[model samples]
Target: AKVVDIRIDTSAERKPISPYIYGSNQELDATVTAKRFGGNRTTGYNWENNFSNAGSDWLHYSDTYLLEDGGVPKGEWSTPASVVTTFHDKALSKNVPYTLITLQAAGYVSADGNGPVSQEETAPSSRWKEVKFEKGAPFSLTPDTEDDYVYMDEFVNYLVNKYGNASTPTGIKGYSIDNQPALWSHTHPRIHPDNVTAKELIEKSVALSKAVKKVDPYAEIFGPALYGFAAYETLQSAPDWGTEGEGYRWFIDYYLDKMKKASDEEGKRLLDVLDVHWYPEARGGGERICFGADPRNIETNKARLQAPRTLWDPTYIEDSWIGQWKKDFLPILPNLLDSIEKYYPGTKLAITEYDYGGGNHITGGIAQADVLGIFGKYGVYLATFWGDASNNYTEAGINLYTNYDGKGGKFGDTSVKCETSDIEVSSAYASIVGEDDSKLHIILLNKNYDQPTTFNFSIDSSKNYTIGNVWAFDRGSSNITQRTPIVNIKDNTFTYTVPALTACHIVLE
Candidate 1:
């Protein structure tokens, strides 16, 4: 008896959807719009050499595994920023448009690939090379190998010289300050063993952003890639938040204010995107959805289906720690927008890393589809799916937008006004290409686990849509297949049914 009425107005609310939203950190599908270089291995990554520290993920070892494993043959390890150079080369070869590279702002990187560094031999030893963002010297194609400093801007120059700047189609588009900094002291104790403060992070970000902007003026600078809720609340409960974050409501506001001031002082926008990571703490059946929740568990799957509500639904009070205590910020997107509007008006927002676990099952695909639809509707400038490398379902979730038809079919570029009668169980998003209403694209999700949902689609548009085609992405397969056609559609109105715990994309022409 459950029915969803999808109301869409083509010309009412039109905003261009960010092409970068359908992206990931790992190199997965060819349809990915943006590819990022992040994770713990990148925090202490030295572009000058191929060596990188393992931090807490391994034995605190400095090694060449990152380069070797990333498909960079060890023979070319002597080249400057060879890891990055190879990554960009691969991205361009794949025709991927946007590439985000990580710049080391964590003070130091592994100087050699010779095993683990002992406790007595932390930083300030030969174990690490000091990181300098602005070398203030001429660029070089083949960098000096004897130097103790690995310059960040020099890496940018290298990439720019090899590929191109951000303006070109094959150029690197973004350069993040670093990976998650909040956990750096703990994750990379051998390099930076103290708790990072607000002032320290801000200064590092400002200087790094300045250096990056100077090198590639068209490049978008992303910074302060926070780890989780703790980092967002207090920059990983930073030591100096109480003192330095005097008048700000939250750390996001303070960070935005600082970046805005720096942008003003520099006479250019230094921080183009407010970067952060999100691994949902939302739980189902006493298990958190992130970090890989059990997809087979009934309650956990149920929770996963409903978890996307927390992104924009005020009615959703998640069972996670953030939902229980931080009710004011229960719906995260608006709060982020409020902070941005108040502090930095035009700065874009980017979730450089995010994962809503269940990567192995139908729940994973449903939640993934829901998250992407939410990203398009909520005005998220950029978002990249970060999950288990083996998560085929999660990757398929992204395909629902970029390659929903498997023949390179895609959703429209501009988002329009669309709403479902109920958001808890069914969510809908509508879009059209530019200002043309020739074909309206819709992404609809059915969260109910037991029954199929009948949807009544009502469209208010200038053109009359006569025919419609639909594709289904469910547990049957990772490939999106054309399942059933829209029963009948005229004057931009129709009725359709979608299976439970499933999602689909509709194209009306």
Candidate 2:
């Protein structure tokens, strides 16, 4: 059977050694109010700069963080200016600063959860409302107000002034243009003018982005964190908030072309990153985090999600999302990547937010360990674990608390180049690469709840070295403790027995 390709030459290997995509989930309101975590301060890893009104978890803060405006502020300080100071100290931290921020109109609900609110509520011709800034205390802005520009200018300048030279990682990257800008009017009912034209969205996004850039010359921004295709035929539907209905077709090529043309004419970078959100829903299969359903329904739904193909004979499994996923989805990945490269070469691709759907599925960690291997093999960077927190009524997958609890147990190295075999009954990888070929990391996700299986892995070593296997996280135990899982490494290969229904990351060096 033909298996996924694994490269020998490090350079030729699609996987990059850098872990550039390391990041965590950020919600504005969640970061501000520590109600669940005891008045905790949201900043550092848990927060990203974004712009949204009160009641939403993640929102942005402009400069002059002070506002007498209404709505709940995330970081409550006495005044706008001082609020920025508070945000800086509480969230930005002395050494670590945010790399990206986003603004979402759909993720928010009115304080009363009753109806249309914020900018989406105001008519395009109406004046903007004063939204309480999440961070800078007492700061607010109305729709289309120039204050938005001023606030962002001061905010970026503060970042530059404070950390530009203070020895931090590359300064804050930039903004994530409107979040699912098309979904607002469609999925949301409280908003005004439920039907928005594509041209209007394009124009509004462009204007808002420019206002941000006028402040900092060196900043990287991303855009349109949208869901992938729906059903292949209706995939082009322009979401509820939109009318263009180009679906994946128009969103990808059309947006890039628009940005490129604007850059040529205005001499400014409109977008630095191409953004997309993945959920098994629109495509028909899988779960939507906390929402649950029968596995049979999941199977039925998955079939409706796949794209038409001629390479292989269509089977019942091929028609369903998860079934098709289990059989050949990995192989189809290259086609999507190739498309992105063809249309927007050199631009980085980001699955900004993703998860199997939020759930108590304990096996999720095991699934995650497997997915990580796939990401490395395919050269995907920055795959943020979605539903890392309890979102409303749903809490899915692994959360920051679990990771924090399981830190010392590093089962998988995000830096390693991954290789696999012909039949994948379970997820596995050869990791922990060394310069002299001194070491290798072998990870196995033995999903079988019964018999244990022994497997061997080989790699070219640059020098004579000692090899040892360490279980970064122990599946046998409920507590987070590191244990030695390594068995043997010889003749440029290592052998180990993996227990069923558990995940293992073994270190060889």
Candidate 3:
């Protein structure tokens, strides 16, 4: 019923789209180039004994779930960092590069995987093990198996020794400071009962990152994985904030400044990426879209389609607490870039965990596809899908960009300018291979739940594209099947109808 105009300028806004942006926390067998070992349990995880505590998230229990839950056979759980070994091994088997492993910085780990830790059993008790940042001893090829102390630096050394340095195919490409340090006290009360201070957090981060760099200089470091908006605002409203973080605009500014100073002193950049997690509080028709939306909720589907604009759109205000209380930070990607440019000029950004619910519906696919386009459009160093893999539709969205043809075919590495007349009704992304601009890859999205629209594309490029190979998924199905190619093209222009709540990928030459 409506016509939407799309403009693609290949010469403008050309940048290498990070291959790691299509990463996930599970299953590296497909086009997923990166895998992450992160969660609440990993925060209190012990690499030496394979003992992990789930903090308050799981009855404050220290159990074998971390070691046994992922179906890694218990026979190979014989060494320190066994879970990491399992994680790395899977990536290697699948030829996946750029792996990310979580490092413990919460000061303690579960001493035993035998049972639960009571409040009385919090850190300094027999139920916990003190985590040593420096180790202060000679690096050992075979770490002590019966020591009271667990060394973070020693763990890094062990990985480097087992897997070779990060340049090697076996080495891990990245190391995360921890899952969510801002929520450590509540999430891992048994390990850290008191709220972590701003001063203490920076000190631990600097020390742990220094050790990680010492062992594997090539491995990128992502720090202070804050849980959400409140954590980013004030490190979860730190108790000692006034003493250590008064003059700064936000906790992120303070963190970047301190990390830059640490890099200056250490003669190496300690913090490679500013790590954060986002669970959009954005709601649709009174239903939250990211965390608790029913897959079948009609209102929720409409909200999900528009929610991604909050990442970069200044004119679009989402419906959420953040939208209501803190309008300044509504568009998160720009605020982050602003903070980094002012404090640490070259520090990169990563949303290591984020999810927009409705993994069971086609709207979820459209929203996820839109999120990936925005991620590529703006510069996001790395992002990982934080949802269950059982949701086929959500994964299908990722496949629309990563493996559209089911033959390991992918979107181009170079991003170009692609925009739609109306963001509410449609979203578009275009890219081309660096050496060969003759071929182009594009993703076109339709968000209208009730009305389909005619996408009239006006591609402004130096090269000529006469044929378009179209593959699309709609409300009828989640599979990306090949549609009839658009053989008729007039002067780098084409027309296609994107059905209601659908997303499609097109190849042109």
- Candidate 3 has an lDDT of 0.85
Q: Model 3: per-residue lDDT, tens digit, 1-509? A: 89999999988889988888887876632367678889788888888878888777779888878778756678856567888888888788876777889999888887778788888877888888889877888988666757778888899898999899888878988999987888888888778778999988999999989888888889889988899999888898899877678798789899999999989998999999999998888898788996767877788888888899999999888888899888977688999989999999988888888888888788888888999888887888888888776667778888888899998888898999888899888899999988467888999998888988898989988888989998888878878899999887799988888778888899998
Order of models, best TM-score first: 1, 3, 2
Residue pairs in collision within model 3: none
C-alpha TM-scores of all predictions: 0.98, 0.66, 0.98
Model 1 per-residue lDDT at 187: 93
Better of 2 and 3 by TM-score: 3
Task: Please write out the lDDT profile of model 1 over residues 401-437, one tens digit for every residue.
Answer: 8898777899899999998998878888889998898
RMSD of each: 1.2, 8.5, 1.4
- lDDT of candidates 1 onward, in order: 0.86, 0.41, 0.85
Q: In model 2, what is the error at residue 237, expressed in angstroms?
A: 2.2
| Lowest-sum lDDT 10-residue window in model 1 | 483-492
Error of 3 at 456 (Å): 0.8
Number of clashing pairs per prediction, in order: 1, 45, 0
Supply candidate 3's per-residue lDDT for 336.
90
